[PDB]
Structure formats: C-alpha cells, structure tokens
Amino acid sequence: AMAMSDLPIEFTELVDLMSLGISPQFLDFRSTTFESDHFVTVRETKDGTNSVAIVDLAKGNEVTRKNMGGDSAIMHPSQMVISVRANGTIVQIFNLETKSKLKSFTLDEPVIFWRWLSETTLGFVTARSILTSNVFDGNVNAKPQLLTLRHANLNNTQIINFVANKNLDWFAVVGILQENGRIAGRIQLFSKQRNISQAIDGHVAIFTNILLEGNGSTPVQVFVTGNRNATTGAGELRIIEIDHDASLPSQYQKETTDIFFPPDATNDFPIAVQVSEKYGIIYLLTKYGFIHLYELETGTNLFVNRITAESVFTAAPYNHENGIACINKKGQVLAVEISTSQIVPYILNKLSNVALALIVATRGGLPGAD
Amino acid sequence: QDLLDL
Amino acid sequence: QDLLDL
Amino acid sequence: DLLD
C-alpha cells in the first residue's frame, strides 16, 4: 500500500555480511546469532578447526576472527564477552578484553538453546529444563541455577526464543513446530514468584512497560505476544497487563488486534517482536520480511510495509531499544526505526488523501458538489 | 485457573 | 532440522 | 579451552 519513503520510518543497512567474506552456508538461525545491534556472531564450521567471526557493528563493522572448537557461540548485548558451548554440555564464557574466563562448567543434560535475558543474566533451555546464570557473579565454576521445568506444550518443538522482564520474575520460552503444512508456535509463560507456568499459542513474545494517564511517572507492565493459527491462518497480536499495582489508578485494558497477511503470504508467520518504550511502538516482523507498526496503548496497527524480499531468520532491538534490526537469508542486516521528525509530513499527506477521497465521494453519493 | 487471560 | 531455515 |  505504501513505500518506505512515504512512511515515517527510517531504513538502514547496518552491514552486508556477504561483502565481508561470510559464506552463505553460515547465514542461518543456528550459525549467525544476533543478540543486540552491537555484534553479529558467525560460527564457521568448515573443516573441524571451526572459527568465529565477530562483526562489531559499532566500530565500523570490524571483524575479529578466532578459531573455536564448539557447536554454538553468542555475544553479549553490549560488552565484549563471548559465550561458547560444545557438545551442548561444555560451556565456557570469556571476556575478550581482559582475556579472563568468566565462566566454565559442564551441564548434566545438553543445552538446546540459549540467549541473554538481560545485561547481567544468560538463559539456558535444555530438552527438559529452563536454567539461568549470573555470569558476572564471580563464581567461575558455578553451574546455572534451575529456573523451572519445560511445559509439555513445548515438547517436540524447537526452542527459538527466551525472554524476560526487567525484574527477571516473568519469563517466556518460545518454541515452534511444523503443523498442517505451516509453522505453529507455542509459548510457556512463567511467573517466578508464583512458581506457575501457562501454555499459550504464539510465535513471538516480549515484556515491556507503558505509562498510562493518571499513573504519574510510574509505568505499568505489559506482555506482548503474536501468533498465527496454523489451521485457520488467522493472526493475532495480544497485549495484556502483568502484576498490576493497586496503588496505581489506571490499568492497561487488554487489547487484541488482527495481524494482516496478504494473499501471497499464506505460509508467512511472525518471527520477531520488539517494542520502543519511549515511543510506545510495537514492531512485529514476519519471516517473509513484512514489518508491522502498532501503537502500544491501543494496539492499533499504524502501518504495514515490506522491508525485504529475502526471508529473515533472526532479529534484535535497534538503536537504544527504539527500533528493530534483523538479518535476512542473504546476510543483509536491516534496521527499521520510527522517526518522529517524519510524522508531520506523513500526516499532511494523509490529510490531503482524505480531502481528495471526500471530493470523489461527493462525486458519488455523498452530499456535496454544491 | 490461569495466570493471564491469554 | 531448522524450521526457520525452511 | 574452547577458545584462545
């Protein structure tokens, strides 16, 4: 419906990985990890003596290549810390500027998936359990503390995400499976203080905050989740409040919104979701490359646009969690960010559009034309 | 019953 | 198998 | 060590 130029969002290409000598075989969800807009980590398994490329997106996409002997490697959201795992069992986390081994241990059961829950905490998911590690606590040989057990709805799925709230007492683990020819998503929600889990359908999940009128300067906590039904194709975005403070007068009213899928994208599904707390914007990215911008307080879709033709396989927050970055199958890392300085021109054009539409309606059956 | 109305 | 790489 |  619209072009990139006319929409009030700025589009950037942070790096072309393939123009840096990165082979297309390593541009997949398990080989190229994306934890923040600071580093890209490419695990190159090529002849036994595997290597890792760390692309520093901040310092002019500088490539630091080192030979590594593991089957997975990820970078810290902002520091120069690398976590490496081998056989799913031996885990070793290093600071690269102090040359110091922050952590080193061996789990009993292998780790299927891991991700940084916060600047301080790294989450692990095994075939049966969900664990968490404070890698900066000083205890080098300390194995991760068990968080909870995997809900049965996650069985026979591949875990693709692990998200937490800022207080680290609400968690969501996202797995997907193949169903009715499409991709179905399952989410385990977990409240730590209640020690209770809940099973929902969904491809994407995130926790965020929003200041509501009347609550002063105190935010309210909301959980955002996106799903597309593998059977019906219906897609839904849901925003629901968690742990409301009774001293606050205004609470977030649960919102549900339809997610749009064009007729050619029947096998598309949501792959990522990021939220700008500052601007109250939900960015929902799909695998085919469609970005949706929703307004956080009302859940209303502001606009939909196609930012890439190649499929995306991973995403992350961009700027200071004000936008969304993603890596497509080609290796382009693309960033999308709302730009308030472009909203006024966008509004002026929409006002012209509605004036013209009114005029043609008066050409039809609307009272007018004098 | 459930944690949330999801 | 990698579902996201399908 | 998995890295050096």
PDB file of N, CA, C and O in Angstrom, chain A residues 123-174:
ATOM      1  N   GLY A 123      20.279 -16.970  29.814  1.00  0.00           N
ATOM      2  CA  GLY A 123      19.326 -18.053  29.966  1.00  0.00           C
ATOM      3  C   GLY A 123      19.674 -19.274  29.133  1.00  0.00           C
ATOM      4  O   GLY A 123      20.187 -19.159  28.023  1.00  0.00           O
ATOM      5  N   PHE A 124      19.354 -20.455  29.671  1.00  0.00           N
ATOM      6  CA  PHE A 124      19.586 -21.743  29.026  1.00  0.00           C
ATOM      7  C   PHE A 124      18.281 -22.518  28.966  1.00  0.00           C
ATOM      8  O   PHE A 124      17.488 -22.483  29.909  1.00  0.00           O
ATOM      9  N   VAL A 125      18.074 -23.242  27.873  1.00  0.00           N
ATOM     10  CA  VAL A 125      16.979 -24.197  27.764  1.00  0.00           C
ATOM     11  C   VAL A 125      17.570 -25.532  27.343  1.00  0.00           C
ATOM     12  O   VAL A 125      18.342 -25.592  26.380  1.00  0.00           O
ATOM     13  N   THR A 126      17.222 -26.597  28.064  1.00  0.00           N
ATOM     14  CA  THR A 126      17.645 -27.938  27.700  1.00  0.00           C
ATOM     15  C   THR A 126      16.462 -28.671  27.071  1.00  0.00           C
ATOM     16  O   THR A 126      15.462 -28.063  26.676  1.00  0.00           O
ATOM     17  N   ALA A 127      16.573 -29.993  26.958  1.00  0.00           N
ATOM     18  CA  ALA A 127      15.453 -30.776  26.455  1.00  0.00           C
ATOM     19  C   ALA A 127      14.309 -30.864  27.460  1.00  0.00           C
ATOM     20  O   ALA A 127      13.173 -31.147  27.065  1.00  0.00           O
ATOM     21  N   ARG A 128      14.569 -30.570  28.735  1.00  0.00           N
ATOM     22  CA  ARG A 128      13.564 -30.735  29.782  1.00  0.00           C
ATOM     23  C   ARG A 128      13.494 -29.584  30.773  1.00  0.00           C
ATOM     24  O   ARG A 128      12.440 -29.407  31.396  1.00  0.00           O
ATOM     25  N   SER A 129      14.547 -28.787  30.941  1.00  0.00           N
ATOM     26  CA  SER A 129      14.594 -27.771  31.980  1.00  0.00           C
ATOM     27  C   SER A 129      14.915 -26.406  31.389  1.00  0.00           C
ATOM     28  O   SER A 129      15.323 -26.277  30.229  1.00  0.00           O
ATOM     29  N   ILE A 130      14.715 -25.383  32.219  1.00  0.00           N
ATOM     30  CA  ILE A 130      14.992 -23.996  31.885  1.00  0.00           C
ATOM     31  C   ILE A 130      15.833 -23.436  33.020  1.00  0.00           C
ATOM     32  O   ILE A 130      15.394 -23.442  34.181  1.00  0.00           O
ATOM     33  N   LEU A 131      17.030 -22.957  32.688  1.00  0.00           N
ATOM     34  CA  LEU A 131      18.032 -22.538  33.651  1.00  0.00           C
ATOM     35  C   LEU A 131      18.443 -21.097  33.376  1.00  0.00           C
ATOM     36  O   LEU A 131      18.216 -20.554  32.290  1.00  0.00           O
ATOM     37  N   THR A 132      19.082 -20.491  34.370  1.00  0.00           N
ATOM     38  CA  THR A 132      19.520 -19.109  34.281  1.00  0.00           C
ATOM     39  C   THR A 132      20.854 -18.959  35.004  1.00  0.00           C
ATOM     40  O   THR A 132      21.102 -19.638  36.005  1.00  0.00           O
ATOM     41  N   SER A 133      21.733 -18.110  34.472  1.00  0.00           N
ATOM     42  CA  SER A 133      23.078 -17.958  35.007  1.00  0.00           C
ATOM     43  C   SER A 133      23.450 -16.486  35.114  1.00  0.00           C
ATOM     44  O   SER A 133      23.294 -15.731  34.150  1.00  0.00           O
ATOM     45  N   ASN A 134      23.918 -16.079  36.297  1.00  0.00           N
ATOM     46  CA  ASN A 134      24.539 -14.769  36.501  1.00  0.00           C
ATOM     47  C   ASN A 134      26.026 -14.935  36.211  1.00  0.00           C
ATOM     48  O   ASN A 134      26.824 -15.263  37.092  1.00  0.00           O
ATOM     49  N   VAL A 135      26.408 -14.691  34.955  1.00  0.00           N
ATOM     50  CA  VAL A 135      27.779 -14.944  34.529  1.00  0.00           C
ATOM     51  C   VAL A 135      28.769 -13.924  35.070  1.00  0.00           C
ATOM     52  O   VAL A 135      29.981 -14.107  34.912  1.00  0.00           O
ATOM     53  N   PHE A 136      28.291 -12.845  35.694  1.00  0.00           N
ATOM     54  CA  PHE A 136      29.163 -11.816  36.249  1.00  0.00           C
ATOM     55  C   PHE A 136      29.241 -11.875  37.774  1.00  0.00           C
ATOM     56  O   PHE A 136      29.692 -10.912  38.404  1.00  0.00           O
ATOM     57  N   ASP A 137      28.858 -13.003  38.377  1.00  0.00           N
ATOM     58  CA  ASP A 137      28.803 -13.090  39.833  1.00  0.00           C
ATOM     59  C   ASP A 137      30.154 -13.375  40.476  1.00  0.00           C
ATOM     60  O   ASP A 137      30.292 -13.191  41.689  1.00  0.00           O
ATOM     61  N   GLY A 138      31.140 -13.822  39.703  1.00  0.00           N
ATOM     62  CA  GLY A 138      32.472 -14.072  40.202  1.00  0.00           C
ATOM     63  C   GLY A 138      32.794 -15.534  40.444  1.00  0.00           C
ATOM     64  O   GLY A 138      33.976 -15.882  40.549  1.00  0.00           O
ATOM     65  N   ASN A 139      31.779 -16.393  40.552  1.00  0.00           N
ATOM     66  CA  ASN A 139      31.977 -17.827  40.773  1.00  0.00           C
ATOM     67  C   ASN A 139      32.166 -18.491  39.416  1.00  0.00           C
ATOM     68  O   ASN A 139      31.194 -18.793  38.721  1.00  0.00           O
ATOM     69  N   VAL A 140      33.425 -18.745  39.054  1.00  0.00           N
ATOM     70  CA  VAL A 140      33.750 -19.200  37.703  1.00  0.00           C
ATOM     71  C   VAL A 140      33.147 -20.575  37.434  1.00  0.00           C
ATOM     72  O   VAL A 140      32.675 -20.857  36.325  1.00  0.00           O
ATOM     73  N   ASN A 141      33.164 -21.457  38.433  1.00  0.00           N
ATOM     74  CA  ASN A 141      32.747 -22.843  38.270  1.00  0.00           C
ATOM     75  C   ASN A 141      31.296 -23.078  38.670  1.00  0.00           C
ATOM     76  O   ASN A 141      30.899 -24.229  38.875  1.00  0.00           O
ATOM     77  N   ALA A 142      30.489 -22.024  38.750  1.00  0.00           N
ATOM     78  CA  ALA A 142      29.103 -22.136  39.196  1.00  0.00           C
ATOM     79  C   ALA A 142      28.194 -22.491  38.025  1.00  0.00           C
ATOM     80  O   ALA A 142      28.086 -21.729  37.060  1.00  0.00           O
ATOM     81  N   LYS A 143      27.553 -23.653  38.109  1.00  0.00           N
ATOM     82  CA  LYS A 143      26.596 -24.079  37.099  1.00  0.00           C
ATOM     83  C   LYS A 143      25.301 -23.270  37.202  1.00  0.00           C
ATOM     84  O   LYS A 143      24.976 -22.746  38.267  1.00  0.00           O
ATOM     85  N   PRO A 144      24.553 -23.136  36.102  1.00  0.00           N
ATOM     86  CA  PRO A 144      23.372 -22.258  36.123  1.00  0.00           C
ATOM     87  C   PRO A 144      22.296 -22.757  37.080  1.00  0.00           C
ATOM     88  O   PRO A 144      22.063 -23.959  37.214  1.00  0.00           O
ATOM     89  N   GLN A 145      21.660 -21.811  37.773  1.00  0.00           N
ATOM     90  CA  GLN A 145      20.542 -22.118  38.662  1.00  0.00           C
ATOM     91  C   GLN A 145      19.290 -22.494  37.872  1.00  0.00           C
ATOM     92  O   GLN A 145      18.947 -21.831  36.888  1.00  0.00           O
ATOM     93  N   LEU A 146      18.626 -23.576  38.286  1.00  0.00           N
ATOM     94  CA  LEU A 146      17.408 -24.012  37.614  1.00  0.00           C
ATOM     95  C   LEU A 146      16.305 -22.983  37.822  1.00  0.00           C
ATOM     96  O   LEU A 146      16.033 -22.562  38.952  1.00  0.00           O
ATOM     97  N   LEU A 147      15.667 -22.587  36.724  1.00  0.00           N
ATOM     98  CA  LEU A 147      14.570 -21.635  36.778  1.00  0.00           C
ATOM     99  C   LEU A 147      13.243 -22.370  36.904  1.00  0.00           C
ATOM    100  O   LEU A 147      12.483 -22.113  37.843  1.00  0.00           O
ATOM    101  N   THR A 148      12.970 -23.307  35.998  1.00  0.00           N
ATOM    102  CA  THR A 148      11.766 -24.142  36.105  1.00  0.00           C
ATOM    103  C   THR A 148      11.893 -25.306  35.124  1.00  0.00           C
ATOM    104  O   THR A 148      12.920 -25.464  34.454  1.00  0.00           O
ATOM    105  N   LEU A 149      10.835 -26.102  35.001  1.00  0.00           N
ATOM    106  CA  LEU A 149      10.821 -27.187  34.031  1.00  0.00           C
ATOM    107  C   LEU A 149      10.008 -26.797  32.801  1.00  0.00           C
ATOM    108  O   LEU A 149       9.097 -25.967  32.868  1.00  0.00           O
ATOM    109  N   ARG A 150      10.345 -27.415  31.670  1.00  0.00           N
ATOM    110  CA  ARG A 150       9.653 -27.116  30.424  1.00  0.00           C
ATOM    111  C   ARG A 150       8.237 -27.665  30.454  1.00  0.00           C
ATOM    112  O   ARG A 150       8.013 -28.833  30.776  1.00  0.00           O
ATOM    113  N   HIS A 151       7.279 -26.810  30.117  1.00  0.00           N
ATOM    114  CA  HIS A 151       5.896 -27.246  30.000  1.00  0.00           C
ATOM    115  C   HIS A 151       5.754 -28.254  28.861  1.00  0.00           C
ATOM    116  O   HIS A 151       6.519 -28.242  27.890  1.00  0.00           O
ATOM    117  N   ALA A 152       4.744 -29.123  28.979  1.00  0.00           N
ATOM    118  CA  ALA A 152       4.562 -30.189  28.000  1.00  0.00           C
ATOM    119  C   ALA A 152       4.232 -29.638  26.618  1.00  0.00           C
ATOM    120  O   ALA A 152       4.538 -30.281  25.606  1.00  0.00           O
ATOM    121  N   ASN A 153       3.619 -28.452  26.545  1.00  0.00           N
ATOM    122  CA  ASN A 153       3.284 -27.911  25.235  1.00  0.00           C
ATOM    123  C   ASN A 153       4.525 -27.619  24.402  1.00  0.00           C
ATOM    124  O   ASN A 153       4.412 -27.445  23.182  1.00  0.00           O
ATOM    125  N   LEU A 154       5.695 -27.512  25.031  1.00  0.00           N
ATOM    126  CA  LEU A 154       6.927 -27.266  24.298  1.00  0.00           C
ATOM    127  C   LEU A 154       7.595 -28.549  23.822  1.00  0.00           C
ATOM    128  O   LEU A 154       8.588 -28.482  23.086  1.00  0.00           O
ATOM    129  N   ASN A 155       7.054 -29.707  24.182  1.00  0.00           N
ATOM    130  CA  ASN A 155       7.649 -30.960  23.750  1.00  0.00           C
ATOM    131  C   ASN A 155       7.550 -31.090  22.239  1.00  0.00           C
ATOM    132  O   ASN A 155       6.601 -30.597  21.620  1.00  0.00           O
ATOM    133  N   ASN A 156       8.575 -31.708  21.647  1.00  0.00           N
ATOM    134  CA  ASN A 156       8.656 -31.946  20.209  1.00  0.00           C
ATOM    135  C   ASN A 156       8.626 -30.651  19.396  1.00  0.00           C
ATOM    136  O   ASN A 156       8.195 -30.647  18.242  1.00  0.00           O
ATOM    137  N   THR A 157       9.098 -29.547  19.977  1.00  0.00           N
ATOM    138  CA  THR A 157       9.270 -28.286  19.268  1.00  0.00           C
ATOM    139  C   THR A 157      10.738 -27.891  19.318  1.00  0.00           C
ATOM    140  O   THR A 157      11.517 -28.433  20.107  1.00  0.00           O
ATOM    141  N   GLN A 158      11.133 -26.970  18.444  1.00  0.00           N
ATOM    142  CA  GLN A 158      12.471 -26.400  18.515  1.00  0.00           C
ATOM    143  C   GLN A 158      12.375 -25.025  19.171  1.00  0.00           C
ATOM    144  O   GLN A 158      11.671 -24.137  18.679  1.00  0.00           O
ATOM    145  N   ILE A 159      13.021 -24.889  20.328  1.00  0.00           N
ATOM    146  CA  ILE A 159      13.016 -23.636  21.070  1.00  0.00           C
ATOM    147  C   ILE A 159      13.741 -22.569  20.263  1.00  0.00           C
ATOM    148  O   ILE A 159      14.884 -22.759  19.831  1.00  0.00           O
ATOM    149  N   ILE A 160      13.072 -21.445  20.036  1.00  0.00           N
ATOM    150  CA  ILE A 160      13.650 -20.360  19.254  1.00  0.00           C
ATOM    151  C   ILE A 160      13.768 -19.064  20.031  1.00  0.00           C
ATOM    152  O   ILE A 160      14.420 -18.129  19.539  1.00  0.00           O
ATOM    153  N   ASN A 161      13.166 -18.952  21.217  1.00  0.00           N
ATOM    154  CA  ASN A 161      13.330 -17.702  21.950  1.00  0.00           C
ATOM    155  C   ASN A 161      13.163 -17.907  23.450  1.00  0.00           C
ATOM    156  O   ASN A 161      12.528 -18.861  23.908  1.00  0.00           O
ATOM    157  N   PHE A 162      13.736 -16.964  24.203  1.00  0.00           N
ATOM    158  CA  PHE A 162      13.712 -16.963  25.665  1.00  0.00           C
ATOM    159  C   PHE A 162      13.781 -15.501  26.095  1.00  0.00           C
ATOM    160  O   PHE A 162      14.793 -14.836  25.859  1.00  0.00           O
ATOM    161  N   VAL A 163      12.701 -14.988  26.686  1.00  0.00           N
ATOM    162  CA  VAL A 163      12.578 -13.570  27.011  1.00  0.00           C
ATOM    163  C   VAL A 163      12.192 -13.412  28.475  1.00  0.00           C
ATOM    164  O   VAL A 163      11.527 -14.273  29.059  1.00  0.00           O
ATOM    165  N   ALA A 164      12.587 -12.285  29.063  1.00  0.00           N
ATOM    166  CA  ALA A 164      12.261 -11.997  30.449  1.00  0.00           C
ATOM    167  C   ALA A 164      11.873 -10.532  30.592  1.00  0.00           C
ATOM    168  O   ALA A 164      12.066  -9.716  29.688  1.00  0.00           O
ATOM    169  N   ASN A 165      11.307 -10.205  31.744  1.00  0.00           N
ATOM    170  CA  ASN A 165      11.019  -8.817  32.040  1.00  0.00           C
ATOM    171  C   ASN A 165      12.207  -8.228  32.789  1.00  0.00           C
ATOM    172  O   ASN A 165      13.154  -8.932  33.148  1.00  0.00           O
ATOM    173  N   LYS A 166      12.153  -6.919  33.041  1.00  0.00           N
ATOM    174  CA  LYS A 166      13.302  -6.249  33.638  1.00  0.00           C
ATOM    175  C   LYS A 166      13.567  -6.742  35.050  1.00  0.00           C
ATOM    176  O   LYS A 166      14.732  -6.861  35.450  1.00  0.00           O
ATOM    177  N   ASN A 167      12.511  -7.066  35.801  1.00  0.00           N
ATOM    178  CA  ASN A 167      12.670  -7.587  37.150  1.00  0.00           C
ATOM    179  C   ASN A 167      13.115  -9.038  37.187  1.00  0.00           C
ATOM    180  O   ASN A 167      13.396  -9.544  38.277  1.00  0.00           O
ATOM    181  N   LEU A 168      13.165  -9.717  36.044  1.00  0.00           N
ATOM    182  CA  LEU A 168      13.564 -11.126  35.972  1.00  0.00           C
ATOM    183  C   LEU A 168      12.717 -12.010  36.891  1.00  0.00           C
ATOM    184  O   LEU A 168      13.227 -12.869  37.615  1.00  0.00           O
ATOM    185  N   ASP A 169      11.401 -11.811  36.840  1.00  0.00           N
ATOM    186  CA  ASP A 169      10.486 -12.709  37.531  1.00  0.00           C
ATOM    187  C   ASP A 169       9.298 -13.125  36.672  1.00  0.00           C
ATOM    188  O   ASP A 169       8.466 -13.904  37.144  1.00  0.00           O
ATOM    189  N   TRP A 170       9.193 -12.627  35.440  1.00  0.00           N
ATOM    190  CA  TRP A 170       8.314 -13.165  34.410  1.00  0.00           C
ATOM    191  C   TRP A 170       9.157 -13.583  33.210  1.00  0.00           C
ATOM    192  O   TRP A 170      10.104 -12.885  32.827  1.00  0.00           O
ATOM    193  N   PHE A 171       8.833 -14.745  32.645  1.00  0.00           N
ATOM    194  CA  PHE A 171       9.622 -15.322  31.569  1.00  0.00           C
ATOM    195  C   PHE A 171       8.703 -15.925  30.518  1.00  0.00           C
ATOM    196  O   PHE A 171       7.566 -16.303  30.807  1.00  0.00           O
ATOM    197  N   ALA A 172       9.211 -16.007  29.293  1.00  0.00           N
ATOM    198  CA  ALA A 172       8.502 -16.645  28.194  1.00  0.00           C
ATOM    199  C   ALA A 172       9.502 -17.420  27.350  1.00  0.00           C
ATOM    200  O   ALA A 172      10.543 -16.882  26.958  1.00  0.00           O
ATOM    201  N   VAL A 173       9.206 -18.689  27.094  1.00  0.00           N
ATOM    202  CA  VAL A 173      10.036 -19.519  26.228  1.00  0.00           C
ATOM    203  C   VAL A 173       9.200 -19.886  25.010  1.00  0.00           C
ATOM    204  O   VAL A 173       8.075 -20.384  25.149  1.00  0.00           O
ATOM    205  N   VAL A 174       9.752 -19.648  23.823  1.00  0.00           N
ATOM    206  CA  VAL A 174       9.032 -19.795  22.565  1.00  0.00           C
ATOM    207  C   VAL A 174       9.650 -20.936  21.784  1.00  0.00           C
ATOM    208  O   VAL A 174      10.857 -20.917  21.498  1.00  0.00           O
TER     209      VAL A 174
END
